[PDB]
Amino acid sequence: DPNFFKMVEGFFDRGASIVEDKLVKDLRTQESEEQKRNRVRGILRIIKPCNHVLSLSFPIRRDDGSWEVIEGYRAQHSQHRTPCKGGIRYSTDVSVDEVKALASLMTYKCAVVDVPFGGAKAGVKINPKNYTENELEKITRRFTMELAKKGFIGPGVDVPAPDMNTGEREMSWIADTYASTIGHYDINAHACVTGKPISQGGIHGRISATGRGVFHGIENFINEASYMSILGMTPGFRDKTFVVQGFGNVGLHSMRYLHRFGAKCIAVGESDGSIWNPDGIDPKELEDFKLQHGSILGFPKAKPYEGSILEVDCDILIPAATEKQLTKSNAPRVKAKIIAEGANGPTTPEADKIFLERNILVIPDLYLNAGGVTVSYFEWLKNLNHVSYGRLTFKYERDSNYHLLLSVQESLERKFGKHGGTIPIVPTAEFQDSISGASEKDIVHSALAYTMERSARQIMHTAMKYNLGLDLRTAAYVNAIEKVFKVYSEAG
């Protein structure tokens, strides 16, 4: 119901009041415990509001010869860690308050997955369906030009990212404009933006990054007995029914990695309909069907579902579409026990209250929806390294692994007086695939799993410390606030 800007400030104030006394304890300045609380409450007053907001009004020229002035905004919430990171939205519904809110969310999201980026967010007020491809390029490049001279884009100041109505195509124009004009003398000019194509300096494994992040986000809690015991489910993914809402980029890879581990997708719903099949839906069949006709309506191996996709009887619900889809109205009717927020703030704070009362696990967005942001940090490092991950180590590591297995083979053959080839030590079926198909995608996906797993322990620890139970969101915001605070406190 309420605007998202009202939500993030409420999440911050709730986490700031809980972590306040622990910040004063671990703060070891040369003051008494009364002045230290003034510093804690003083630093928290700095982190909460956005530091910089650039309102723009640049002109473009349409193909018909007409003139048009475009309106755009970009907010930098925190500068405690440079550069700033965030997406760019090309919608009509974009406002400044909505930009400052998602900019603050990016700050706390980056801190959860231990990504050293300040939160940022951008948005121009156009509808891309009303502009041609050539017109969209002039809007993108000119927007990049105006952000560059005002210090709102660059490899060490602000690194934008894709968002709604924005893909890798816009990121190419953004990196190309900066690398040819203001940042021509910058050796890392192509690190000014992420989400780029592989040809323009992108990283492998980016398309399925956010989808793999929501899988490892559920997996880290689906395999913990203490959390599954509070619900009525056994640990594991076998015979787990999950519903995907919004068959977009995240929803496509979310169901593919859940179906891979034994989970059965019983329903997928978008804005134009919802299909249903309690015996499972093949992700590959639905992906090829979505590509052909641009909609999941009329799937052969499924039946139309004339009802709310969020109220389907299931175990896991994955909202991966629009904002505020679970409010005080439909939340008391949700049958799922685990809610994985594949989108940015799809649950109202009032629905969070009854979800905690109904004993329903809600994995928060600032942790679970950070898979793409994690490898966006990896793409930024890749452009700084000027080389793909594993380019210099793949053959070196592969030869070392074959040396290790051969050392076991020869040592055992010599121990028992057998000639060569008698005791073959070969990699397993899984190890052989990880060796032959070794690519940069393999390293960034394992690095994403390491980040999502390690962040899950930090959330489980502080939630268990403050007896927050199934309130994963509060425990997540307490982790982010405490991390940003230590950067401010230990600096002066």
The catalytic residues are 121
Map the footprint of a copy of itself across residues 338-357, applying CB under 8 A. none
Question: Considering only residues 469, 486, 487, 488, which one is a binding residue for Na ion as defined by CB under 5 A?
Answer: 469
Query: Is residue 491 close enough to count as binding another protein by CB under 8 A?
Result: no
3-state secondary structure of 78: coil
Which residue is it, tokens 């390294």? 385
Query: Is residue 150 close enough to count as binding a copy of itself by CB under 8 A?
Result: no
Map the footprint of another protein across residues 276-335, applying CB under 8 A. none
Residue nearest to Na ion (CB): 350
Query: Is residue 168 close enough to count as binding Na ion by CB under 5 A?
Result: no
- DSSP string for residues in 104-170: HHHHHHHHHTT---EEEEEEEE--GGGS-HHHHHHHHHHHHHHHHHTT-SBTTTEEEE--TT--HHH
Map the footprint of another protein across residues 123-182, applying CB under 8 A. none
337 binds, among Cl ion, Na ion, a copy of itself, none (CB under 5 to 8 A by kind): none
Q: In this complex, which beta carbon is closest to a copy of itself, that of residue 237 or of residue 477?
A: 237
Query: Is residue 446 close enough to count as binding another protein by CB under 8 A?
Result: yes
Q: In this complex, which beta carbon is closest to a copy of itself, that of residue 187 or of residue 406?
A: 406
Report the C-alpha gap between 205 and 212 in whole angstroms: 10
Q: Name the one range near another protein by CB under 8 A: 30-38, 169-177, 312-320, 411-419.
A: 411-419
Report the C-alpha gap between 449 and 451 in whole angstroms: 5
Single-letter amino acid, residue 2: P
Residue 426, number of CB atoms within 10 A of its CB: 10
Give ∠ CA 401-405-410 in degrees, rounded to 5.
Answer: 140
Question: Considering only residues 38, 298, 330, 431, which one is a binding residue for another protein as defined by CB under 8 A?
Answer: 431
333 binds, among a copy of itself, Na ion, another protein, none (CB under 5 to 8 A by kind): none
Report the C-alpha gap between 424 and 405 in whole angstroms: 9
Contact between 210 and 253 (Cβ < 8 Å): yes
What binding mask, one character per residue, do residues 243-282 give for a copy of itself by CB under 8 A, x or -? -----------------xxx--------------------
348 binds, among a copy of itself, Cl ion, Na ion, none (CB under 5 to 8 A by kind): Na ion
- DSSP string for residues in 239-264: T-EEEEE--SHHHHHHHHHHHHTT-E
Single-letter amino acid, residue 214: V
Spell out a b/e string for 129-146, using b for 16 or more CB atoms within 10 Å of the CB, else e: eebeeebbbbbbbbbbbb
Give residues preceding each break in the chain, C–N over 2.5 A: none
Q: Within its chain, how far is the Cα of 111 from the centroid?
A: 12
Strands 67-76 and 274-276: unpaired
Map the footprint of another protein across residues 234-263, applying CB under 8 A. 235
Q: Could you tell me which residues are annotated as the binding site?
A: 22
231 binds, among Na ion, a copy of itself, another protein, none (CB under 5 to 8 A by kind): a copy of itself
Q: Name the one range near a copy of itself by CB under 8 A: 20-28, 73-81, 364-372, 378-386.
A: 378-386
Query: Is residue 461 close enough to count as binding a copy of itself by CB under 8 A?
Result: no
Q: Could you tell me which residues are annotated as the binding site for substrate?
A: 22
Q: Name the one range near a copy of itself by CB under 8 A: 12-20, 48-56, 104-112, 386-394.
A: 386-394
73 binds, among a copy of itself, Na ion, another protein, none (CB under 5 to 8 A by kind): none
> From the CB of 229, what's the least distance to another protein, in Å?
7
Beta bridge partners of 123: 73, 89
3-state secondary structure of 468: coil
Map the footprint of another protein across residues 348-407, applying CB under 8 A. 378, 380-381, 384-387, 389, 391-397, 399-401, 403-407
Q: Does a cis peptide bond (omega within 30 degrees of 0) precede residue 49?
A: no
Nearest to 201 by CA among 439, 392, 386: 386
Query: Is residue 411 close enough to count as binding another protein by CB under 8 A?
Result: yes
> From the CB of 462, what's the least distance to Cl ion, in Å?
11
Q: What is the size of the binding site for Na ion (CB under 5 A)? A: 4
Question: Considering only residues 442, 475, 476, 479, which one is a binding residue for a copy of itself as defined by CB under 8 A?
Answer: 442
What binding mask, one character per residue, do residues 204-233 give for another protein by CB under 8 A, x or -? -------------------xxxx-xx----
Report the C-alpha gap between 294 and 299 in whole angstroms: 12
Helix crossing, 4-26 with 96-112: angle to 10°? 40
Question: Considering only residues 49, 235, 332, 420, which one is a binding residue for Cl ion as defined by CB under 5 A?
Answer: 420
> From the CB of 474, what's the least distance to another protein, in Å?
17
Map the footprint of Cl ion across residues 135-194, applying CB under 5 A. 138, 142
Q: In this complex, which beta carbon is closest to another protein, that of residue 322 or of residue 446?
A: 446
Q: In this complex, which beta carbon is closest to Cl ion, that of residue 228 or of residue 452?
A: 228
Give ∠ CA 439-237-322 in degrees, rounded to 5.
Answer: 80
Report the C-alpha gap between 191 and 438 in whole angstroms: 25
Contact between 105 and 112 (Cβ < 8 Å): no
List interacting residues with another protein (CB under 8 A).
Answer: 223-226, 228-229, 235, 378, 380-381, 384-387, 389, 391-397, 399-401, 403-408, 410-412, 415, 421, 423-428, 430-431, 434, 442-443, 446-447, 449-451, 453, 457, 460-461, 464
List interacting residues with Cl ion (CB under 5 A).
Answer: 1, 138, 142, 420-421
